């Protein structure tokens, strides 16, 4: 099946690669992306614990919040890393690394 990665709006920053692989994008995770993931997961776990007290399922509520937060934070970190690596975001550090 044919797939085209071209976006409607042109990137405003130099493009390291148009279609970076999943492993490369994951390996591009800087400390800021890890902070994003950690903050989102912690917010989700705290919300789950604080909301699951009344029903009585604190462990299950934290587990569900943890899965939701892990998914959301990983999606956000991957989004930021890919946007930087395709030149959509201010990717000064990996542009310098590529150069």
């Amino acid at each position: 099946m044919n797939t085209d990665i071209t976006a409607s709006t042109k990137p405003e920053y130099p493009v390291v690669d148009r279609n970076p692989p999943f492993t490369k994008v994951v390996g591009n995770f800087s400390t800021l992306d890890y902070l994003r993931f950690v903050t989102i997961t912690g917010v989700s776990v705290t919300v789950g614990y604080l909301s699951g007290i009344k029903p009585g399922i604190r462990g299950p509520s934290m587990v569900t919040g943890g899965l939701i937060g892990v998914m959301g934070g990983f999606m956000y970190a991957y989004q930021n890393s890919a946007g930087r690596l395709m030149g959509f975001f201010p990717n000064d550090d990996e542009v310098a690394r590529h150069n």
Partner: peptide, 30 residues
């Protein structure tokens, strides 16, 4: 005698401290 015996509450406190540290680091690095 001087220990919190609730595992779930302890994990929640750890997650909250981790959240605060992550938010502070995000603010400082942003």
């Amino acid at each position: 005698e001087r220990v919190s015996t609730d595992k779930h509450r302890n994990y929640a406190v750890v997650a909250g401290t981790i959240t605060i540290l992550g938010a502070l680091g995000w603010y400082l690095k942003g």
